[PDB]
Ligand binder design. Structure first.
Ligand SMILES: *C(=N)[C@H](C[C@@H]1CCNC1=O)NC(=O)[C@H](CC(C)C)NC(=O)c1ccc(-c2ccc3c(cnn3C)c2)cc1F
Lengths: 301, 302
């Protein structure tokens, strides 16, 4: 038993982290085979970041302007290119610690682990979700750029996120490993707002099932609802609509607990309309939406 | 602020499986020794009432199967230290980090690398509760998973998982095999005492709120340590030790708020409540962030 926010073991990713420096600008890179991936704004000075013409800045750089360090060993850069907002540095040595890996672009609501790094050195690991407004509610300080998000399946690391920036509200924005931002953001030193965020309903439902599996049942009720009437209330409260695919992927939890998905939906509807009344669920005073159905099944089975 | 675990790679490189008969659990391979729970030498029926000295004298080195993945490590010695089994193996682990064995206090936090059949599955952050349980997340086969902190490049191992209690909390030992709390490695009804709130960590959390500009709860009073301890116990809060006051030193200096002034502010929060206001966005006080965790998350950690 037990239920905790849980990250993937980070060792396979730790073995890939390096430091990348251009001028006075240092951040993290990801070293896979003979290529180092990092945010392109490493090539900017402080004045460059206000309105950077990245292609001009990169054409004015040479290989020796990039200092790559794996621990105390300098890696010689022998080529460079740019793919969207990611800079790619070919080095003259293959990383012997390279895991089996893939690059994927995740969907809102999906979760991943973040290895927060500074100066190429791993600092901490934690679990994140892609928000519906395509920000992530991360924990990142100065120098964290180039830290990555990932999932692990068997022995294969699927990289899904590279960190680029923080927004005025404190949430974070970044790219996939092709350099394309999640969301309407740009790698420029300007204050940028996100769209209004919403709550990930399928994840809240998974977490309520987790609560039942671990003995928290006070929020249950006899009632059921139709899917449409649930979605009407959900949208009223800025919750994402629940699709039939969502109902289906909740099936295993429904069977494990004996609680139909639409019965649990009636419970959540009651919680939205009435609140928690000073009570807590799994120790939380708010409805948690950063566990997927898969996460709950994995931790409870 | 968010619970974050230490990077787990240095510990992942030390996880192995240990099997006796059909019982498999996890072990920790450091240099040429593997550490694991001694109840690996028990059958399910043995666990109801085990005699560990008598079970272990019937074992030889060749009864223990130690595997790093599919690779067997030959056992060349064995001994029991309290509730931990130590197996000397014929291979020194090339991935051995700099390490230490530490016994932590209630309230201290650590990362747990949850493992199954020697294979790391997940990492999460835990606090040792004042009743010497942890609110962990463990399935069957997780025994022998370890808890740790990392300081510079040194791994301090502080917990090895042994058992689940009726309330669903977890119990275990340090790496010298001494249980935290009054628990035993026997399959009987065991109860954790009623738990309490970790005062030193609530104070750390309040300092963290002040650092972020959220300081409505600061009052103009101070208190003595004795008076605060006596009041706090009436609210199911732990009393503070001198060591607690010391580890709050850095946050007190960073904010300019004496530890005892913050104690008086917390005392007011307890006697008067929150009154529908929040601290760091939350209506509950958080008690599983240590002073070190606050400094970690707010500053550059390795
Ligand atoms: C990578 N190392 C950093 C990570 C940042 C640093 C602070 N916390 C993080 O997560 N990335 C950057 O510094 C990027 C560089 C860009 C991509 C060129 N910039 C930012 O993260 C960034 C940009 C703008 C603001 C900002 C600007 C004006 C504001 C704000 C609030 N009110 N006004 C008027 C915020 C902040 C910011 F961190």
């Amino acid at each position: 038993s037990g239920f905790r926010k849980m990250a993937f073991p980070s060792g396979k990713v730790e073995g890939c982290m390096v430091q990348v420096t251009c001028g006075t600008t240092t951040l993290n890179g990801l070293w896979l085979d003979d290529v180092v991936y990092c945010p392109r704004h490493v090539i900017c000075t402080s004045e460059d970041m206000l309105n950077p013409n990245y292609e001009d800045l990169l054409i004015r750089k040479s290989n020796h302007n990039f200092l790559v360090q794996a621990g105390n060993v300098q890696l010689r850069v022998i080529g460079h290119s740019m793919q969207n907002c990611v800079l790619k540095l070919k080095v003259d040595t293959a990383n012997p610690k390279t895991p089996k890996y893939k690059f994927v672009r995740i969907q809102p609501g999906q979760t991943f682990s973040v290895l927060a790094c500074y100066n190429g050195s791993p600092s901490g690991v934690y679990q994140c979700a892609m928000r519906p407004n395509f920000t992530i509610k991360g924990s990142f300080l100065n120098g964290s750029c180039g830290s990555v998000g990932f999932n692990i399946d068997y022995d294969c690391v699927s990289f899904c996120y590279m960190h680029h920036m923080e927004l005025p509200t404190g949430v974070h924005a970044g790219t996939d490993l092709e350099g394309n931002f999640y969301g309407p953001f740009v790698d420029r030193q300007t204050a940028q707002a996100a769209g209004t965020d919403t709550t990930i309903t399928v994840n809240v439902l998974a977490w309520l099932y987790a609560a039942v599996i671990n003995g928290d049942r006070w929020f249950l009720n006899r009632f059921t609802t139709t899917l449409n009437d649930f979605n009407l209330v959900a949208m009223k409260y800025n919750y994402e609509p629940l699709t039939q695919d969502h109902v289906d992927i909740l099936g295993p939890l429904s069977a494990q607990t004996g609680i139909a998905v639409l019965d649990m939906c009636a419970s959540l509807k009651e919680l939205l309309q009435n609140g928690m009344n000073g009570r807590t669920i799994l120790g939380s005073a708010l409805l948690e939406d950063e566990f997927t159905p898969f996460d709950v099944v994995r931790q409870c089975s």
